[PDB]
């Protein structure tokens, strides 16, 4: 197993680096969504995480998009489950 | 209920609420009018 | 605005050391930026910080600030008309606000002193009456002037407890 | 120059503390309220609370604002 | 020019007399 | 005397050190001025004061010390 | 210089507060009306009446000596740093770093303590070893006082 | 000669001999009974 | 022989806000109302003094149980917060790919007043406050590879916090147990060994085997976290788990036939550190937790509860007596089943000692991947758990004294092991004081003599390694026996417990995970210093406990209370006689000692262990100056305080500028504490009188009369601010230094 897993680590390394950069950028931008003007007063009435999950966010949503991009087939993605009840209060 | 409101009206809870709100307004003013060394004229 | 030099302090807008301060900070920001690729969120955050630094330095230039040899703005508090916004106007704002706070407090303590159990209301604040007195304390300077003129601001000497000496 | 300045300032501060201590001692041992009745000294005793309170005010103002400006910087 | 030995010892003997006088003053104070 | 000759390039000497606890590096490091023994560098300004008042030689200082010994007696 | 002179004013006003309070409440106060009957220096009047520790005028002096040492240290720190900047020929160092406390802690205390603490070390000693020993000596006495 | 002799004598005299006699003497007086 | 059973009073107290509206309901003097400003401090001081509220022990026990429930809810909130921040405010996923070069960070500040500079360049295309809690290393060692797992456990922790609060409400307002429920200590031990520690360790061993072990093995092999199969795919798919570790192809047959040697691939006794991650082998930790689980499960069947097999702890106490100890341990069962404070004293003492051992064992044997290499988290964890330990020990002394004043009954302790201690407390305290003096004189002169000799230019007369050899021969002997343990006395161990004993320095990514630690003369001197400082803290605390009820100065001290300021200026002056005041001074010395322990740790690790191998020997952080400089107070002042302060004092304009600001602020708080410490209430009360005159002049006089702090409260504030300022100064110094140097 470890042989093929290392082989596809080598074959997918660039995409996972992009994934890690995107999630880190999302996590950092999560402190600047009002200063930069992404989840302002209207859009963040509910959870701005829910805004990123459902609506549109410059960085958070990006991660939401690539987080499950190009993952292993057959297995549920390491970054997110197939489904889940909504985050507690969009938190 | 009413007693809880009275409990809120206690000195510590009211101090915490009043300073929470005050810090909030001061932070918002320093966000929308940032970096104010002096009153402009 | 263009301010005259005063107390051997040149205006910050025309000060070379002020420009050096701006330059230095902006270069530091660039250095911090260089390690981040432009697409990532720290790069945009640092660019926004650079913008903020530029507009701060610009605003300090235009606001008629006097800089020193060090290159940082210096406040003139002697009362000069050209630098009243440094101390006088914010000083007036503080004196107004602090007097409001104090007069709201004095009004509440005097009103609660008439209650059946004043000390319990001292820790459990009657919020409606409190807020009424707080908003009445908007005209603190007037009401304080009335108290001073009528002699009820200050308690007489005989009523106050003093040491036996 | 540095040693002499430090020397005389520390000596001065101690001497000042002694002056005030000996005045407290004067008030205890040597002050006669009956003989000093009505003079400036008995008047000092009469408005001592005002003096102490205004000293407390000026000290509090100076320390609040000086420390605040230092912390701000 | 260093001080001569006679100078040092004369000053030291004057000091010894001064010290004797200091003892006389101390005894007189103690009374 | 030497300090008077070159006031700006001679460190004043306060008094010789005779410490039994000194090691050889201490004896060799505390020998400043033109002393042949370990010394302390007079930071009290007495050299400048005595030079300003006209004292120039060790004999004048000795005469002054003897006179003040007599005054103390 | 503005900020340090106001610090000095704080120190003088507070030391004077403590000392004038001691002098004027020497003969009695509301906590202890008959203080003149106990002399200048007494320990306290017991734990009763809430507690009367450091109530005597002697104790007011004892408290004011701390503030006096603090004020004089502030003045002579100001003197020494301003003059050191003058004597190196770069007065800009003080004029830059005296506006904030870290500047005093770094560019004056930490910066000028380098040669002092190196009076003696594992690589021998120099003429400042006695002053290093006295520095640590005074630290010892200060702590023992605590 | 004074310079080579007197320090080596008077430093122990003032820092070991005089302290010993003074402390012993003061002890004997302080502990001396009133009568 | 009472039967162990569940007992409850149904609906003992109604749920209502009427008591919230009325402050000080729990007392009688505080219930009437505030006459003076002392009332506020009295309210907060006796808020959790349940013994002084109600006389009956049943209500106290219920209050303690539900308060414990509330604390556990608070802890679960804190854990939920930490995991949630590690999910939405961190670079844990980036750090997973590059743990050696990315700084862990799980806190990002809002950009408001220029504080955005605190968001440091921690790596991974991320900015934030670098964290030193080691949470990233813990999560990696637990097998967490995605932020969703962190979010999921954070939400679980929040649910559990809600459940903990609900349990406290249920067990105070709905189903409060009776007193006879809490007094079932046999059952308590049976459950808290077999079920809390035993089953908890078994559960964690199962997690480690089924989730952490495969995930961390793949990470060790170099597999990308985003390509690793999910934990349920390892726990459930036995073929997938057996691919990594072939013993899983045999199922549970070896387990149930005592063929446990077949599990040797994933249950090992390797010892030492993982060369890739620099942490303990996870197979070793799994086998550890398994054996711990078994040992506690067996040991939790010691005590008889409802079936005749088992022990009665009263009997095994009373049967232990001897010629020197009179009646022995008779009556201690009554002490520890009818006094919460006695139990609290024991449990706090052991918790504090344990936290200390935890710090030692975690620096020396780093249990987490990429923990040792991260010097900042390692120093932070050591220092933290040291401070927690010293505080808990001081509290143990305090609660020992509280029991001794309040809950000690001479009738039930006639000639037992405690009464005889109270009957020769003079000998104990005099010998301890003598020991304390001896230790201090010798150890300090070891430093002061060295200072003097160095200043006099006599290095050959110093106590350094070169001049006079005070070698710690016994500690070196222990190091030798432990380095040779895997050969003779621990033959099945493939390696030593730690690399600190000797040989084969462990390096990960250039930096040293673990390095054998040497012990020269400086180590001797600092360890005897540690013993000195410990013995003085023990002197203070034990003197307070033993003289809590009486002394030759005050015989009637038991009725004065545990916490009183003095007995007056009589008898020459009776200040700080109460055992509370001993805890005050005891707390002070505790602080002092910890300050030396953590300084020794920091300097020794920076000088002789931490560093970076470059193929040409070790390049330590400070260059190994400890062995030749840590024998002098000047050496600590210059080469440790002055030298290593450059990071914190020059931290302005960088992400560590917050550490510099805290450094100054903590200096201020310490000096501010000196106000409360060096002064007394009488002065402050008179100053208040003058200020009250000023207020009365303007008719601003408060209804609640202003009062100076009580003398006990003044000492309390002084010690609290002193400990805060000193510890926060050391915190800012250590964190800024170790983060900047790396
Ligand atoms: C960032 C700005 C800032 C901040 C945070 C503070 C903070 C503070 N100031 Mg400072 N101050 C500032 C700017 C600031 N000041 C400036 C720009 C000025 C120039 C006007 C002052 C002048 C000033 C004075 C003169 C005093 C303070 C005092 C205080 C403290 C209580 C103030 C208050 O409202 O209490 C609540 C208010 C009350 C309880 C009412 C009390 C009376 C108030 C302070 C003034 C009203 C009296 C009236 C106008 C006459 C003034 C006479 C005066 C000119 C001598 C507090 C620590 C007071 C202090 O600590 O001294 C002991 C004080 O006496 N401040
Ligand atoms: C011309 C100056 C002068 C004069 C005449 C006096 C005279 C007097 N004072 Mg005042 N006083 C002075 C200066 C003066 N003092 C100063 C400057 C201070 C401030 C420090 C004080 C503070 C002061 C207080 C607080 C009190 C007095 C008292 C007294 C009286 C008794 C002194 C005593 O108790 O015995 C002699 C005193 C001592 C033997 C104690 C000296 C202990 C010193 C501090 C030890 C110092 C250690 C040393 C320097 C370290 C060496 C170096 C180290 C490296 C080893 C006496 C009337 C007391 C009294 O009852 O008044 C009526 C009293 O309560 N005075
Ligand atoms: C650095 C240490 C320190 C500091 C800050 C103070 C401060 C003070 N002392 Mg103390 N004192 C100290 C050491 C110190 N002392 C020591 C060691 C001694 C020897 C025993 C004394 C002896 C002493 C006496 C005997 C007297 C004072 C007095 C005073 C006041 C002088 C007036 C002033 O400066 O007001 C400015 C006040 C301050 C700088 C205090 C700190 C206020 C902070 C900045 C505000 C904090 C706000 C912030 C939101 C807090 C967050 C906390 C949050 C967690 C709740 C002030 C409260 C005098 C007094 O009462 O005058 C009225 C007085 O009579 N002190
Ligand atoms: C030990 C407990 C603990 C601590 C110390 C913190 C501390 C912090 N949190 Mg976290 N948090 C926690 C538990 C904790 N949290 C838990 C249990 C939850 C889930 C309910 C959260 C959910 C949470 C969110 C969603 C956010 C924070 C944020 C923050 C920061 C600002 C708080 C704020 O909004 O101002 C106080 C505000 C008001 C009182 C209004 C601060 C570093 C914010 C942050 O990091 O911003 C970048 C942020 O966005 N926290
Ligand atoms: C298998 C049985 C078992 C287990 C696991 C525990 C576990 C615990 N007990 Mg103990 N206890 C037991 C049996 C058990 N108890 C028995 C039989 C009695 C009666 C003699 C007591 C009486 C007792 C007292 C008097 C107190 C405790 C306390 C504690 C907690 C200490 C805090 C700690 O270590 O956090 C470990 C934390 C965790 C393991 C996190 C999860 C927390 C939950 C609560 C664990 C569930 C345990 C529970 C027994 C099972 C649910 C039963 C419920 C549905 C009825 C800990 C949770 C103290 C406490 O904190 O009170 C709340 C306390 O004051 N227990
Ligand atoms: C508490 C710790 C813990 C836990 C939970 C597990 C759990 C597991 N281990 Mg591990 N293991 C552990 C510790 C643990 N292990 C330790 C310490 C060791 C070292 C000796 C091992 C060594 C080990 C090996 C070598 C193997 C396992 C395996 C397994 C699995 C097999 C379970 C099974 O079918 O057995 C029988 C279990 C049961 C009969 C219980 C099921 C009962 C259900 C829940 C009843 C519910 C009924 C309900 C009332 C009504 C139904 C309807 C309702 C749902 C609606 C399981 C996931 C095997 C595996 O497949 O791993 C990949 C395997 O080969 N374990
Ligand atoms: C398992 C731990 C434990 C438990 C259950 C208790 C429980 C109790 N203790 Mg013990 N104690 C402990 C640990 C513990 N303590 C430790 C570790 C110490 C050493 C410090 C002590 C020292 C101690 C003393 C000396 C005394 C007690 C007392 C008490 C009782 C009353 C407490 C109360 O209402 O105060 C409520 C709590 C407070 C007033 C504390 C306020 C917070 C302080 C100032 C610290 C905050 C520091 C903070 C972390 C820093 C940041 C602050 C920030 C906001 C700026 C109660 C029985 C008192 C008693 O009468 O016993 C019967 C008593 O006199 N305890
Ligand atoms: C650096 C400061 C300092 C020093 C030196 C001491 C020293 C001492 N304290 Mg104190 N203490 C201090 C600060 C200090 N404390 C502070 C700030 C607190 C917080 C309030 C305490 C709280 C406190 C308590 C509560 C207790 C102590 C105790 C002790 C003793 C412990 C035994 C010991 O050290 O061996 C002996 C002494 C030393 C090693 C001190 C240094 C002396 C050096 C080595 C010089 C040796 C002789 C030298 C050559 C001089 C002779 C020649 C000379 C005449 C010229 C000792 C007298 C304990 C005690 O007395 O029981 C034993 C105790 O119970 N102290
Ligand atoms: C306690 C700590 C300590 C220790 C262990 C030493 C040790 C030493 N010093 Mg240092 N020193 C210290 C503190 C200390 N010093 C301090 C605090 C200072 C002040 C700054 C100095 C200043 C100093 C100087 C200036 C010099 C030394 C020197 C020396 C050496 C010779 C001293 C001597 O002649 O002892 C004489 C010793 C005794 C007469 C007796 C010692 C005690 C006996 C052995 C106790 C035995 C009790 C026994 C176990 C009980 C048995 C009972 C049984 C019968 C029932 C020695 C290495 C000298 C040197 O250069 O040598 C290297 C020197 O010149 N020291
Ligand atoms: C500008 C100027 C001028 C003027 C000046 C002046 C006028 C000054 C002053 C000064 C002063 C005016 C000062 C003062 C000081 C004071 C003090 C320093 C005080 C103190 C006090 C005390 C110490 C007290 C004591 C006592 C007591 C406590 C009680 C009893 C009594 C007695 C008294 C004993 C001229 C033109 C000439 C010149 C130039 C400059
Ligand atoms: S506390 Fe204040 S009053 Fe009580 S004894 Fe100590 S000093 Fe005298």
UniProtKB/TrEMBL annotation, chain A:
Highest classification ranks of the organism: Eukaryota, Viridiplantae, Chlorophyta, Mamiellophyceae, Mamiellales
Where, in this chain's numbering, is chlorophyll a bound? 45
Q: Name one GO biological process term.
A: photosynthesis
Q: Which GO terms describe its cellular component?
A: chloroplast photosystem I
The keyword Cell membrane is annotated on this UniProt entry? no
Q: Which section of the whole protein is represented?
A: 49 to 139 of 139
Q: How does it sit in the membrane?
A: Peripheral membrane protein
The keyword Chloroplast is assigned to this record:
yes
Q: According to its UniProt record, which protein family does this protein belong to?
A: Belongs to the psaN family.
Q: Where does this polypeptide localize?
A: Plastid, Chloroplast thylakoid membrane
User: This protein is called what?
Assistant: Photosystem I PsaN, reaction centre subunit N
UniProtKB/TrEMBL annotation, chain C:
Single GO cellular component term: chloroplast thylakoid membrane
Subcellular location field: Plastid, Chloroplast thylakoid lumen
Q: What keywords appear on the UniProt entry?
A: Chloroplast, Photosynthesis, Photosystem I, Plastid, Thylakoid
Which sites bind chlorophyll a? 78
List the GO biological process terms.
photosynthesis
Disulfide feature: 12-67
Q: What is its main location?
A: plastid
Describe the function of this protein: Participates in efficiency of electron transfer from plastocyanin to P700 (or cytochrome c553 in algae and cyanobacteria). This plastocyanin-docking protein contributes to the specific association of plastocyanin to PSI.
The family assignment reads: Belongs to the PsaF family.
Q: What is this protein called?
A: Photosystem I reaction center subunit III
**Species, as recorded:** Ostreococcus tauri
Q: What is the lineage of its organism?
A: Eukaryota, Viridiplantae, Chlorophyta, Mamiellophyceae, Mamiellales
Span within the full-length protein is 67 to 231 of 231
């Amino acid at each position: 197993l470890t042989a093929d897993l290392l082989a596809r680590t080598e074959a997918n390394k660039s995409l996972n680096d992009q994934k890690r950069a995107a999630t880190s950028s999302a996590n950092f931008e999560r402190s600047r969504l009002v200063t930069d003007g992404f989840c302002q007063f209207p859009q963040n009435i509910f959870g701005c995480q829910n805004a990123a999950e459902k609506g549109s966010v410059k960085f958070l949503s990006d991660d939401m998009a690539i987080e499950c991009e190009g993952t292993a087939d057959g297995k549920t993605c390491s970054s997110k489950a197939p489904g889940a009840y909504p985050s507690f209060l969009g938190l | 209920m009413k007693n809880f409101q009275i409990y809120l009206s206690t000195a510590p809870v009211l101090a915490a609420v009043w300073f929470t709100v005050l810090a909030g307004i001061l932070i918002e003013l320093n966000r929308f009018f940032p970096d104010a060394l002096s009153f402009p004229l | 605005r263009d301010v005259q030099p005063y107390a051997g302090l040149t205006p910050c807008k025309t000060s070379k050391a002020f420009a050096k301060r701006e330059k230095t900070e902006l270069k530091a920001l660039e250095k911090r930026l260089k390690k981040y690729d432009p697409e990532s969120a720290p790069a945009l955050a640092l660019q926004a910080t650079m913008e903020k630094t530029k507009t701060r330095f610009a605003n300090y230039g235009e606001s008629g600030l006097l800089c020193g040899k060090d290159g940082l703005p210096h406040l003139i508090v002697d009362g000069n008309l050209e630098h009243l916004g440094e101390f006088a106007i914010p000083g007036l704002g503080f004196l107004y606000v602090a007097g409001w706070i104090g007069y709201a407090g004095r009004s509440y303590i005097q009103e609660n002193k008439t209650a059946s159990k004043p000390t319990e209301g001292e820790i459990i604040i009657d919020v409606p009456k409190a807020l009424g007195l707080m908003f009445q304390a908007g005209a603190w300077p007037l009401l304080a002037g009335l108290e001073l003129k009528n002699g009820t601001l200050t308690a007489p000497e005989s009523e106050i407890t003093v040491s036996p000496r | 120059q540095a040693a002499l300045y430090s020397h005389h300032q520390y000596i001065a501060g101690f001497i000042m503390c002694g002056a005030f201590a000996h005045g407290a001692i004067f008030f205890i041992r040597d002050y006669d309220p009956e003989a000093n009745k009505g003079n400036v000294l008995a008047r000092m005793l009469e408005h001592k609370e005002a003096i102490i309170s205004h000293l407390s005010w000026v000290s509090l103002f100076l320390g609040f604002h000086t420390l605040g400006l230092y912390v701000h910087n | 020019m260093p001080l001569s030995d006679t100078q040092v010892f004369t000053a030291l003997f004057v000091a010894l007399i001064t010290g004797i006088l200091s003892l006389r003053l101390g005894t007189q104070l103690y009374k | 005397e030497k300090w008077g000759e070159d006031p700006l390039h001679v460190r004043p000497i306060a008094h010789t050190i005779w410490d039994p606890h000194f090691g050889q590096p201490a004896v060799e490091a505390f020998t400043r001025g033109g002393a042949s023994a370990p010394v302390n560098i007079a930071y009290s300004g007495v050299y400048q004061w005595w030079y300003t008042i006209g004292m120039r030689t060790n004999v004048d200082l000795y005469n002054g010390s003897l006179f003040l010994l007599f005054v103390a007696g | 210089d503005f900020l340090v002179h106001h610090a000095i004013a704080l120190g003088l006003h507070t030391t004077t507060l403590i000392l004038v309070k001691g002098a004027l409440d020497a003969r009695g106060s509301k906590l202890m009306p008959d203080k003149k009957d106990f002399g200048y220096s007494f320990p306290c009047d017991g734990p009763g009446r809430g507690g009367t520790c450091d109530i005597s005028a002697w104790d007011a002096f004892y408290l004011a000596v701390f503030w006096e040492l603090n004020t004089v240290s502030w003045t002579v720190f100001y003197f020494h740093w301003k003059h050191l900047a003058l004597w190196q020929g770069n007065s800009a160092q003080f004029d830059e770093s005296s506006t904030y406390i870290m500047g005093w802690l770094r560019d004056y205390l930490w910066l000028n303590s380098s040669q002092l603490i190196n009076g003696y070390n594992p690589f021998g000693m120099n003429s400042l070893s006695v002053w290093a020993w006295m520095f640590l000596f005074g630290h010892l006495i200060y702590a023992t006082g605590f | 000669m004074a310079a080579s002799l007197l320090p080596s004598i008077f430093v122990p005299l003032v820092g070991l001999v005089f302290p010993a006699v003074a402390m012993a003497s003061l002890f004997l007086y302080i502990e001396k009974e009133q009568v | 022989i009472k039967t162990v059973k569940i007992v409850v009073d149904r609906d003992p107290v109604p749920t209502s806000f009427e008591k919230w509206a009325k402050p000080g309901h729990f007392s009688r003097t505080l219930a009437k109302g505030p006459a003076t400003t002392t009332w506020v401090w009295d309210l907060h001081a006796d808020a959790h003094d349940f013994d002084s509220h109600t006389t009956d022990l049943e209500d106290i026990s219920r209050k303690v149980f539900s308060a414990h429930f509330g604390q556990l809810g608070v802890i679960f909130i804190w854990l939920s917060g930490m995991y949630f921040h590690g999910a939405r405010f961190s670079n844990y996923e980036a750090w997973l790919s590059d743990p050696t070069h990315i700084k862990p960070s799980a806190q990002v500040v809002w950009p408001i007043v220029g504080q955005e500079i605190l968001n440091g360049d921690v790596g991974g295309g991320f900015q934030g406050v670098q964290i030193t809690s080691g949470f990233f290393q813990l999560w990696r060692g637990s097998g967490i590879t995605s932020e969703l797992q962190l979010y999921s456990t954070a939400i679980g922790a929040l649910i559990c916090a809600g459940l903990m609060f609900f349990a406290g409400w249920w067990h105070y307002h709905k189903a409060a147990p009776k007193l006879e429920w809490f007094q079932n200590v046999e059952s308590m031990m049976n459950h808290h060994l077999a079920g809390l520690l035993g089953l908890g360790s078994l559960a964690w061993a199962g997690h480690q085997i089924h989730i952490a072990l495969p995930v961390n093995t793949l990470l060790d092999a170099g597999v990308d976290p985003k390509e690793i199969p999910l934990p349920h795919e390892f726990m459930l798919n036995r073929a997938l788990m057996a691919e990594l570790y072939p013993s899983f192809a045999k199922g549970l047959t070896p387990f149930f036939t005592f063929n446990w040697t077949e599990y040797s691939d994933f249950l090992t006794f390797r010892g030492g550190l993982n060369p890739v991650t620099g942490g303990l082998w996870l197979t070793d930790m799994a086998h550890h937790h398994l054996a711990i689980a078994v040992l506690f499960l067996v040991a939790g069947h010691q005590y008889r509860t409802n079936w005749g097999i088992g022990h009665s702890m009263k009997e095994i106490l009373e049967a232990h007596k001897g010629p020197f100890t009179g009646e022995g341990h008779k009556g201690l069962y009554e002490i520890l089943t009818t006094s919460w404070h006695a139990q609290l004293a024991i449990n706090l003492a052991l918790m504090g000692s344990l936290s200390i051992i935890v710090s030692h064992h975690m620096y020396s044997m780093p249990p987490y991947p990429y923990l040792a290499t991260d010097y900042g988290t390692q120093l932070s964890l050591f220092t933290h758990h040291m401070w927690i330990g010293g505080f808990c020990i001081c509290g143990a002394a305090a609660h020992a004294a509280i029991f001794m004043v309040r809950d000690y009954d001479p009738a039930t302790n006639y000639n037992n092991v405690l009464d005889r201690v109270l009957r020769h407390r003079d000998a104990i305290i005099s010998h301890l004081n003598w020991v304390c003096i001896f230790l201090g004189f010798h150890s300090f002169g070891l430093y002061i003599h060295n200072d003097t000799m160095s200043a006099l230019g006599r290095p050959q007369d110093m106590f350094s390694d070169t001049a006079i050899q005070l070698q710690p021969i016994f500690a070196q002997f222990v190091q030798h026996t432990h380095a040779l343990a895997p050969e003779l006395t621990a033959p099945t161990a493939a390696g030593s417990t730690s690399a600190s004993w000797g040989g084969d320095i462990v390096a990960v990514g250039g930096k040293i995970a673990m390095m054998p630690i040497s012990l020269g003369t400086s180590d001797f001197m600092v360890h005897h210093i540690h013993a000195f400082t410990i013995h003085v803290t023990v002197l203070i605390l034990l003197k307070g406990v033993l003289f809590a009820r009486s002394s030759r100065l005050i015989p009637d001290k038991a009725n004065l209370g545990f916490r009183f300021p003095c007995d007056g200026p009589g008898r020459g002056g009776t200040c700080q006689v109460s055992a509370w005041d001993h805890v005050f001074l005891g707390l002070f010395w505790m602080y002092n000692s910890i300050s030396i322990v953590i300084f020794h740790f920091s300097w020794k690790m920076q000088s002789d262990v931490w560093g970076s191998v470059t193929g040409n020997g070790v390049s330590h952080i400070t260059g190994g100056n400890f062995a030749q400089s840590a024998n002098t107070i000047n050496g600590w002042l210059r080469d440790f305080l002055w030298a290593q302060s450059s990071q914190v004092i020059q931290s302005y304009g960088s992400a560590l500028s917050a550490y510099g600001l805290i450094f100054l602020g903590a200096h201020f708080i310490w000096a501010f504490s000196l106000m409360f410490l060096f002064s007394g209430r009488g002065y402050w009360q008179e100053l208040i009188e003058s200020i009250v005159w000023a207020h009365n002049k303007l008719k601003v006089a408060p209804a609640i009369q202003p009062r100076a702090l009580s003398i006990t409260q003044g000492r309390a504030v002084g010690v609290a601010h002193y400990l805060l300022g000193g510890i926060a100064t050391t915190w800012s110094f250590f964190l800024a230094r170790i983060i900047a140097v790396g």
